[PDB]
Structures are given as C-alpha cells and as structure tokens.
Amino acid sequence: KTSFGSLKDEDRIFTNLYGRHDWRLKGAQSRGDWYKTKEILLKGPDWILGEVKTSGLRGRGGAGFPTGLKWSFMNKPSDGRPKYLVVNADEGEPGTCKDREIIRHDPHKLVEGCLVGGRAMGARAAYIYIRGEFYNEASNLQVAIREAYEAGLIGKNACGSGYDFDVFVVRGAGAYICGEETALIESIEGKQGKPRLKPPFPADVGVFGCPTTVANVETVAVSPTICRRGGAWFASFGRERNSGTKLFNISGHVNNPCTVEEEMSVPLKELIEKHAGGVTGGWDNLLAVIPGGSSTPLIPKSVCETVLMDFDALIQAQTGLGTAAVIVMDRSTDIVKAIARLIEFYKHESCGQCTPCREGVDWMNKVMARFVRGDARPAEIDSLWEISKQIEGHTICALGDGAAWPVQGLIRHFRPELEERMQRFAQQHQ
Amino acid sequence: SNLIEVFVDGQSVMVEPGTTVLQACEKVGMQIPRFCYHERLSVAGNCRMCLVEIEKAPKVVAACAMPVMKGWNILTNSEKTKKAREGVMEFLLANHPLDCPICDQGGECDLQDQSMMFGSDRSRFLEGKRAVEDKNIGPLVKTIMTRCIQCTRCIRFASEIAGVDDLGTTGRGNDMQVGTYIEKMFMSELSGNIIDICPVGALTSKPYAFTARPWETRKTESIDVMDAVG
Amino acid sequence: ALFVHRDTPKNNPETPFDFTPENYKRIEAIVKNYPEGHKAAAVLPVLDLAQRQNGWLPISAMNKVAEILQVPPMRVYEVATFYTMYNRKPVGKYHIQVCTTTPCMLRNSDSILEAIQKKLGIKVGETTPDKLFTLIEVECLGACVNAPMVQINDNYYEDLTPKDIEEIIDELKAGKIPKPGPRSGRFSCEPAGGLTSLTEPPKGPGFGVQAGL
Amino acid sequence: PFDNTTYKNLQHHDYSTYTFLDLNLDLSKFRMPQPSSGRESPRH
Numbered sequence: 001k002t003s004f005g006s007l008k009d010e011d012r013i014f015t016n017l018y019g020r021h022d023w024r025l026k027g028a029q030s031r032g033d034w035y036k037t038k039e040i041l042l043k044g045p046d047w048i049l050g051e052v053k054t055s056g057l058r059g060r061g062g063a064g065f066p067t068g069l070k071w072s073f074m075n076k077p078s079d080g081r082p083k084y085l086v087v088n089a090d091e092g093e094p095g096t097c098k099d100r101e102i103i104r105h106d107p108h109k110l111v112e113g114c115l116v117g118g119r120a121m122g123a124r125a126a127y128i129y130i131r132g133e134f135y136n137e138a139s140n141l142q143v144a145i146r147e148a149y150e151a152g153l154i155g156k157n158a159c160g161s162g163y164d165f166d167v168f169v170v171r172g173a174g175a176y177i178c179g180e181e182t183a184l185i186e187s188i189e190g191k192q193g194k195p196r197l198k199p200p201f202p203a204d205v206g207v208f209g210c211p212t213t214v215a216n217v218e219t220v221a222v223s224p225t226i227c228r229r230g231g232a233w234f235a236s237f238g239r240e241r242n243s244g245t246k247l248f249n250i251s252g253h254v255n256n257p258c259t260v261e262e263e264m265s266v267p268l269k270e271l272i273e274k275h276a277g278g279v280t281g282g283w284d285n286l287l288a289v290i291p292g293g294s295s296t297p298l299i300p301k302s303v304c305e306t307v308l309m310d311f312d313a314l315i316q317a318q319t320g321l322g323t324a325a326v327i328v329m330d331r332s333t334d335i336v337k338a339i340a341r342l343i344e345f346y347k348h349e350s351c352g353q354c355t356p357c358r359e360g361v362d363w364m365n366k367v368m369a370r371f372v373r374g375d376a377r378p379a380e381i382d383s384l385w386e387i388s389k390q391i392e393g394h395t396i397c398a399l400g401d402g403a404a405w406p407v408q409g410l411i412r413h414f415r416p417e418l419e420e421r422m423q424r425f426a427q428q429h430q
Numbered sequence: 431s432n433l434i435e436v437f438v439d440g441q442s443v444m445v446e447p448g449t450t451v452l453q454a455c456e457k458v459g460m461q462i463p464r465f466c467y468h469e470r471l472s473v474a475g476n477c478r479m480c481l482v483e484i485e486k487a488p489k490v491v492a493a494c495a496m497p498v499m500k501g502w503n504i505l506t507n508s509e510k511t512k513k514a515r516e517g518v519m520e521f522l523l524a525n526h527p528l529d530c531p532i533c534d535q536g537g538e539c540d541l542q543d544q545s546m547m548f549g550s551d552r553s554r555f556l557e558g559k560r561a562v563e564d565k566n567i568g569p570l571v572k573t574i575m576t577r578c579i580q581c582t583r584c585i586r587f588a589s590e591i592a593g594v595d596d597l598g599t600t601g602r603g604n605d606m607q608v609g610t611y612i613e614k615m616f617m618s619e620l621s622g623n624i625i626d627i628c629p630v631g632a633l634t635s636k637p638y639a640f641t642a643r644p645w646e647t648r649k650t651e652s653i654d655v656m657d658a659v660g
Numbered sequence: 661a662l663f664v665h666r667d668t669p670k671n672n673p674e675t676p677f678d679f680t681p682e683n684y685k686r687i688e689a690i691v692k693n694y695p696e697g698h699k700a701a702a703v704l705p706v707l708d709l710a711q712r713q714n715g716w717l718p719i720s721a722m723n724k725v726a727e728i729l730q731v732p733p734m735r736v737y738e739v740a741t742f743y744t745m746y747n748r749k750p751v752g753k754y755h756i757q758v759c760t761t762t763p764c765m766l767r768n769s770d771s772i773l774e775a776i777q778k779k780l781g782i783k784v785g786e787t788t789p790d791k792l793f794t795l796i797e798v799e800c801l802g803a804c805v806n807a808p809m810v811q812i813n814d815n816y817y818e819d820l821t822p823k824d825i826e827e828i829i830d831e832l833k834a835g836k837i838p839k840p841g842p843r844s845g846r847f848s849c850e851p852a853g854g855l856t857s858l859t860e861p862p863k864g865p866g867f868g869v870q871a872g873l
Numbered sequence: 874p875f876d877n878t879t880y881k882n883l884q885h886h887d888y889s890t891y892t893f894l895d896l897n898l899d900l901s902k903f904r905m906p907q908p909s910s911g912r913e914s915p916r917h
C-alpha cells in the first residue's frame with residue numbers, strides 16, 4: 001500500500017469517541033470491551049509482549065519509542081520489590097486534547113488496558129495520574145473503576161485469572177512539567193514535580209524506588225485491541241515502522257476544530273480538508289501549521305502540500321509527529337506573537353531545577369517580546385539561534401528541547417518577516 | 431578483580447563498577463568544573479557545568495551523575511565540551527548581579543574562577559536582571575539571595591548532615607527561591623558550614639562581614655580546643 | 661504572587677483550621693491508598709482536600725497536613741508553592757480562569773477576557789468587592805479544539821462568545837449553576853458540520869477476534 | 874433502539890466537590906493490602 005487514509009468505521013480503535021453511546025460498563029461491554037480478557041491474561045506475559053511488539057506500535061506520548069521493547073524492559077524476575085504500571089493522563093501540551101476524550105468517553109478501555117499491561121509486565125497495581133483540571137473526567141474514571149471492581153473484572157482474582165491487580169487514580173495539581181514520566185513519578189511520591197536524571201531509568205528505579213513503567217493513555221487503551229484483533233491487523237495500517245491509527249486534534253484557524261481517529265500516514269492536506277472542513281479562507285489562505293503541538297516546530301504552506309502525518313516523514317521535514325496536534329494559522333496571523341506566546345507558556349511552565357532551561361527560556365521570552373515589538377537588531381537573530389543551541393541537549397529533561405525547537409523553526413522559516421518588522425520599527429522610531 | 435577499563439583523553443585507567451565520570455577524571459588527575467557537586471553530599475546534577483563529551487556518543491552527559499561504561503572514552507578538553515561549559519557559564523552569569531566589589535566571596539569565588547578559566551569573556555545579555563528579596567536566618571549567616579545560583583547545596587546539607595530539614599526551594603521557574611518560606615532562623619550546631627559550601631556570595635559570615643579579603647590573609651594551620659574532638 | 665510568607669493578622673499559624681470527621685475518614689482512605697513507609701505520597705491529595713474544605717490554604721492547613729502526615733512543614737510549603745492550583749491567598753467564590761495560550765488565542769480568547777473584564781468591572785488578578793468572582797489567566801487546559809474556553813471552579817465552559825460568557829456570569833450571579841459544556845451546537849468534540857466519522861453503529865463483542873485466543 | 878444523535882455523558886452535570894473523595898472512600902474496601910518497606914518513614 002502506498003496511499004493512506006480514509007479509515008473505515010469498523011477498524012477504529014476508539015468507538016464512541018464522541019460519547020454518543022453509553023460510557024458505563026453495560027455500554028462498554030456491548031462494544032467489545034472486557035471480552036475474553038481471561039484468555040489474554042492466561043496466554044502469558046511473553047505472548048502479550050510479542051503481540052504488542054509484532055504490531056509495530058510506538059509510543060503515542062510524543063517520543064515515538066517502540067512500546068514493545070519498553071514494556072519488555074521490566075519483564076524480569078522480581079527481587080522482592082513490587083512492580084508498577086503508571087498511566088500518564090496529564091496531557092498538558094497545547095493543542096492536545098485526545099486523552100481527555102479517551103478518559104471521559106471510554107474509561108473501561110483504559111481500565112482493561114491497565115489490566116493487560118499490568119499482566120504483561122507483572123505489575124502489582126496501576127497508578128493513573130490524571131490532570132488536576134480534569135475533575136469530571138477523573139470522577140467518570142473512578143466511577144468506571146468502581147463498576148469494574150464490583151463486577152470482578154479488577155481487584156482480587158481479576159477476571160478469574162488468579163492475578164491480583166488494583167487500579168488507582170491520583171489527581172495532579174496543575175503542572176505541565178508533571179506530564180513527563182520522571183517528574184510524574186516524583187509527583188506521585190508527594191514531592192515537587194522535578195524530573196530525575198536518567199540513568200537510573202524508571203524500569204530500574206521508578207515510583208517509591210520500585211520498578212515502574214510509565215505509558216500514555218492512548219498507548220495503553222489500544223493494547224486490549226492489539227491482543228484481541230492481533231498484531232498483523234494493527235500493522236496493516238500506516239507505513240513501515242509507522243503502523244497503526246492515530247487520534248488527531250485539529251484546531252486553530254480551521255472551519256471545524258475537532259478530534260478524529262485516522263490512519264497513521266494520512267497526508268496533512270487531505271486530513272485537514274476532509275475532517276476539519278478545510279482552513280478558513282481556503283487552502284490559499286494557509287500560512288503555517290504546527291503538526292505536533294507546541295513542542296514541535298512549525299512548517300510553512302510549501303511544506304504542508306505533500307507531507308505525511310507520521311513520525312518519519314515529519315522527522316524528515318525537520319519536525320516531529322509529537323502528540324498529533326495540528327494547530328493551523330492562516331495568513332491573517334501575527335505568527336511572531338504566536339511563537340512569543342508559546343515561549344511565554346514555556347517560561348510559565350518550567351520546573352526551574354536545572355540552569356540552562358531556567359535561565360534560557362526566560363531569555364528567549366524577553367528577546368521574543370522584543371522581537372514582537374520590533375525593538376531589536378537583525379544581528380541578534382542569529383544570536384538567538386545560538387541561545388537555542390545552548391539549551392537543546394544540555395538539560396535534564398526535554399522541556400528545554402521543546403522550548404528551543406519553536407524558536408528555531410520560526411527563525412528558519414520566517415527570518416524575512418522578523419527583519420521586516422525590525423526595519424519598520426527602526427524607520428518609524430528613528 | 432572486577433575493575434573496568436575506561437579512557438580519559440585516550441589514557442586507560444581502571445575503575446570500580448559504579449564509578450562516575452567525574453571520579454574517574456579525578457583519578458587520572460583532571461578536575462571537571464562543578465557547582466552543585468560535593469563529595470560529602472548527595473548528587474543533584476542540576477548545575478550542568480560538569481557536562482562532558484563521550485567519544486562516539488552524540489550527547490553530552492553530566493559527569494557528576496553518569497556512571498562509567500566499559501570502553502568509554504572521556505574527552506575533557508574537546509571542542510563541544512568547552513562549548514557546553516561556555517554556554518552554561520553564560521546562562522549562570524546572565525542573571526547574576528554586578529556585586530563583586532561589595533561581596534565577601536570576591537577573590538575566592540568559585541563562579542569567578544570558573545568564569546575566568548572555562549567561561550567566555552563577554553556578555554550578550556541585553557535585558558534586565560532579576561532581583562530576589564533578602565531573607566533572615568539568624569545573626570550568624572548574612573543572606574543575599576540575589577547572588578544565589580540555585581545549586582541546592584543548602585537543602586542537601588541541612589537534610590543529610592545537619593538533619594534540620596528547614597531550607598527548601600519555593601516557587602517555579604526563574605522565580606524559584608531558596609529559603610525557609612517563613613520568619614525562621616537556621617540555628618543548628620553545624621549551621622555555619624553552609625558558608626563554606628556556598629560557591630557564591632549568597633551566604634556569608636556575618637561577624638567576618640566587610641573586614642578582610644582572601645588574597646591578603648596569612649593561613650596558619652592549627653587545632654581547635656573548644657571541645658575534645660580536636 | 662509572592663513566594664514568601666509574612667504573618668498577617670488574618671493569615672498566621674494561630675489561624676484556626678481543623679478537618680471535619682468525614683474529611684478525616686477521606687484522609688485515612690487516601691493514606692491507605694499508598695504503600696507503608698511512603699505516607700508523604702499522600703501530601704498532594706490531602707492538602708488539596710484541605711483547600712476543598714476552605715477554598716484557600718492559609719498557613720494552618722499546611723502545618724496541619726505536615727502534622728498528620730509526619731513530614732517537615734518545609735516539604736508541604738514546597739508542594740504548595742510549586743503547584744498553581746493551591747491558593748495561598750483567599751480567592752472569591754467563583755474562580756474564573758481564562759485560557760490564553762496560542763490555540764485559544766487563535767480563536768479570539770482575548771475578546772472573552774475583555775468581555776469578562778468589562779462585565780465584572782475588574783482586571784486580571786483582581787477580585788470583585790462582593791468576593792464573588794476572581795478573574796485570572798491560565799495556560800492550556802486541555803480543551804484546545806473547543807477554543808475559546810474558560811474554567812469556573814471545577815466546570816469547563818467551552819466554545820464561547822462574549823454573549824455566552826455574559827450569560828454564564830449572569831446565571832452565576834443569580835445563584836444558579838449552568839451546564840458545563842460547549843455553548844455551540846456540538847456536544848463534546850465532534851465537527852460542527854455533522855459526524856465525519858463513527859457514523860456506523862459499533863460492531864460489538866467478538867468482532868475481528870483472532871484465532872487461538 | 875440505535876441512536877447516534879444524543880449525548881450520553883450527562884452525569885457530570887450532577888457531580889459535587891467531594892464526589893472523587895467519596896468514590897475513593899467507597900473504593901477503599903475493595904483494595905488489596907499494600908506492600909511495606911519495613912519502616913515507618915525514610916526518616917525513621
């Protein structure tokens with residue numbers, strides 16, 4: 001297959017994405033959830049890991065790490081410490097709202113994914129770290145967990161397999177930096193949400209010092225469907241090493257901003273013109289697209305024509321798939337103001353533990369405010385580029401890279417706009 | 431023996447398993463620049479000055495917290511190591527106040543010495559610097575939090591050696607401040623040792639304030655007689 | 661906005677605060693949710709529960725949480741100052757938070773901000789003299805496809821115009837509670853031009869199950 | 874009767890401030906016993 005897209009409704013992972021059906025246990029069990037889970041738990045953790053890694057499923061958090069190897073990292077005999085599975089339900093990245101829909105309208109899929117993953121790596125329990133803002137979603141998730149507990153699906157002797165598995169929900173307290181796995185682990189332990197240094201990896205020392213595997217909501221909820229339908233069916237979609245389906249949140253300057261499930265290698269133009277109803281003012285009015293949320297750089301209208309929405313094609317285009325969050329800006333947008341607002345967001349959401357991000361992101365915030373106002377000189381522009389090269393790769397966590405990348409993308413694709421703004425300010429003020 | 435062979439600038443050296451890169455470089459005789467590392471405190475790894483380049487590895491690693499692997503070639507004088515050191519010095523000196531003539535750490539400041547050795551020689555910071563409100567922790571330690579570099583040796587010493595657990599970092603981002611968050615004094619029997627471990631002039635000795643300068647003092651090695659410890 | 665504390669007469673360690681017995685049972689359940697020897701992992705919910713009893717956190721719930729969990733109070737101070745939800749200053753009855761990040765700014769959230777500022781007669785970070793509304797600015801709240809959007813207390817009000825947020829404020833001032841949903845035609849996140857996907861009924865159990873399972 | 878026109882997630886209109894904590898309190902009776910680290914606290 002060379003052309004991708006137009007996914008049929010029978011192949012969608014997340015049926016009832018929009019909440020049109022019952023989200024409770026009766027409604028979820030009638031859609032195929034919680035079906036033959038005992039066979040999955042009894043066929044073996046190695047069988048589950050093999051079925052996961054055969055499908056070519058990658059991490060849906062944004063890193064794109066292969067989840068089969070990551071889940072098999074902690075598939076080791078115990079040394080007296082318990083093992084833990086942790087679900088990352090923070091979703092603080094701008095443009096990304098898919099996990100909210102997953103935990104609001106399909107919570108039993110998340111619970112079954114927690115059980116299947118915990119059996120896959122021998123985890124004692126599941127700690128779902130939900131966002132603090134998502135109070136109603138957390139209440140719905142706890143209601144579904146209570147329904148699963150009452151029906152005997154989770155808890156002592158889960159689904160009649162002899163495996164004991166608990167599911168816990170921990171509410172956050174409004175921190176974007178707590179979305180990253182090590183900072184999330186420290187946040188569960190009742191400390192400041194400051195990321196750890198790897199090594200040690202969470203598979204060796206994680207939450208409470210126990211071995212821990214942190215996985216996204218989307219990459220957990222697909223695993224029961226992986227075990228039931230099979231890995232080859234999931235591998236049939238998408239290109240090589242880009243297999244499966246993806247939840248895309250299209251927002252910004254579009255006709256119909258929406259969350260939709262589609263294939264992995266869909267062209268961006270086809271996806272926007274089909275599911276979002278096209279951008280405002282037609283495709284000739286498009287200025288820029290951020291394809292993977294605020295952590296990824298933008299691409300201009302020329303790049304957007306023949307780009308595929310998977311990991312490899314966007315890495316080739318000097319960007320990343322990220323969380324598959326398409327923010328669209330038309331030609332009536334002050335894009336420098338948008339990038340300055342993104343850098344201000346990164347300055348306000350920064351844990352401040354390590355020096356390069358803590359000073360540099362504030363430095364880019366000040367110089368991008370000056371760039372928006374035009375009170376700068378062109379020789380600063382390359383200097384700002386160098387500042388980005390002093391943040392990317394020299395930080396504890398990846399918030400520094402995710403703050404340096406939008407500045408680099410904005411500079412690379414719109415240096416003439418910034419130079420025109422600076423020369424206009426110099427003409428009008430001197 | 432279970433020693434493993436690592437390389438510092440092409441020179442082989444045997445180390446115990448679990449040894450860090452910084453300890454191996456100290457074994458071969460090279461002192462990697464550091465701010466938050468202390469051999470009697472727990473490893474924090476946040477100042478990012480100890481970043482060094484391993485050969486055939488496209489990412490600098492923090493030598494104060496990175497255990498050595500077999501066959502690793504550590505390059506302590508490579509080009510990108512010096513680039514990382516210069517960038518970290520620029521970030522550290524971006525918000526530091528111009529207080530060197532009126533600061534008691536002048537002449538024995540670690541930040542000054544490593545800025546002279548491994549840092550650059552000019553500033554590109556055209557913006558305004560931050561200012562931090564001063565704190566009071568007693569009549570022993572004079573506190574100027576504007577000069578702090580958030581190295582978190584304060585909390586590590588007060589939690590692991592003094593056993594007080596009264597200092598901490600309040601806030602987030604560039605507004606993160608080291609303090610007690612309330613009007614409390616840090617009175618332990620080993621409090622003044624924090625003046626020894628602060629690499630900057632944020633915590634100074636209040637009786638010693640504005641009296642002398644390190645280059646003009648003569649050092650005489652003697653023995654304390656205040657107790658029977660010696 | 662200050663990250664240091666000064667003992668005001670209305671905010672001091674002698675300010676009376678204590679948990680209700682049902683809140684105490686909730687606290688016991690929360691600390692039973694965690695393994696033994698790691699009781700400090702319950703610092704994050706329990707302290708928040710204290711705010712859920714008071715609406716704000718003076719420095720007497722901080723010390724009480726530190727006392728009932730056997731942790732030093734400095735760790736509780738660090739936790740309360742690090743996270744943005746913990747109100748160390750007494751906010752009004754309805755804490756309006758307007759998202760002004762780039763995906764919400766692209767859909768004209770500043771118009772909502774100035775509409776609320778004109779209706780309530782206050783500014784960003786200010787409180788009404790009746791102690792009813794507090795208007796501040798927040799980052800992305802995870803409903804970017806429903807931009808522009810505000811959050812009032814625990815509820816989300818999305819897909820708003822200035823008229824819709826004025827009606828929300830009018831309903832809140834009258835003593836009622838509105839429906840926490842998008843103000844447009846769509847229900848949660850579907851496209852406004854009808855369902856572009858998931859039009860077919862779901863297949864049900866046993867669909868596509870591989871052999872040997 | 875199949876119906877794709879109504880929104881079935883209407884329970885969150887009736888959730889109170891203590892709904893999550895009461896749900897956790899009710900769930901506390903179903904949980905398995907927690908493991909122990911052998912000490913009361915790391916400061917013990």
Ligand SMILES: NC(=O)C1=CN([C@@H]2O[C@H](COP(=O)(O)OP(=O)(O)OC[C@H]3O[C@@H](n4cnc5c(N)ncnc54)[C@H](O)[C@@H]3O)[C@@H](O)[C@H]2O)C=CC1
Nearest residue numbers: 061062063065091092093179181201295320322323398402
């Ligand atoms: N989903 C979201 O809300 C956001 C996502 N992102 C994206 O996430 C990524 C940055 O996040 P990270 O967690 O730092 O990604 P990545 O550097 O860490 O690694 C992903 C996972 O693989 C594991 N891993 C990788 N190499 C390993 C090894 N050799 N041994 C053991 N485990 C190993 C890590 O422990 C982690 O769990 C970027 O791609 C960024 O675009 C960024 C911001 C927000």
Ligand SMILES: Cc1cc2nc3c(=O)[nH]c(=O)nc-3n(C[C@H](O)[C@H](O)[C@H](O)COP(=O)(O)O)c2cc1C
Nearest residue numbers: 059060061088090091092179180181215216398399
């Ligand atoms: C600053 C930052 C914020 C992040 N926020 C989230 C998040 O909110 N949700 C999430 O699933 N991953 C987030 N991540 C990515 C995680 O580090 C990690 O990749 C994820 O929890 C698990 O990835 P996986 O899908 O491969 O299992 C964030 C990463 C960084 C650097």
Ligand code: SF4
Nearest residue numbers: 351352353354357397
């Ligand atoms: S890069 Fe920023 S957010 Fe990440 S650890 Fe360093 S200071 Fe914290």
Ligand code: SF4
Nearest residue numbers: 529530533539630631
């Ligand atoms: S601490 Fe060092 S760099 Fe800072 S003012 Fe004092 S001597 Fe100068």
Ligand code: SF4
Nearest residue numbers: 578581582584628632
């Ligand atoms: S005051 Fe000194 S010792 Fe304390 S954290 Fe700051 S730089 Fe480190």
Ligand code: FES
Nearest residue numbers: 475477478480494
């Ligand atoms: S000495 Fe290693 S990061 Fe500070």
Ligand code: FES
Nearest residue numbers: 764800801803804
């Ligand atoms: S950008 Fe406003 S909710 Fe995400």
Ligand SMILES: [K+]
Nearest residue numbers: 625628630633
């Ligand atoms: K000092």
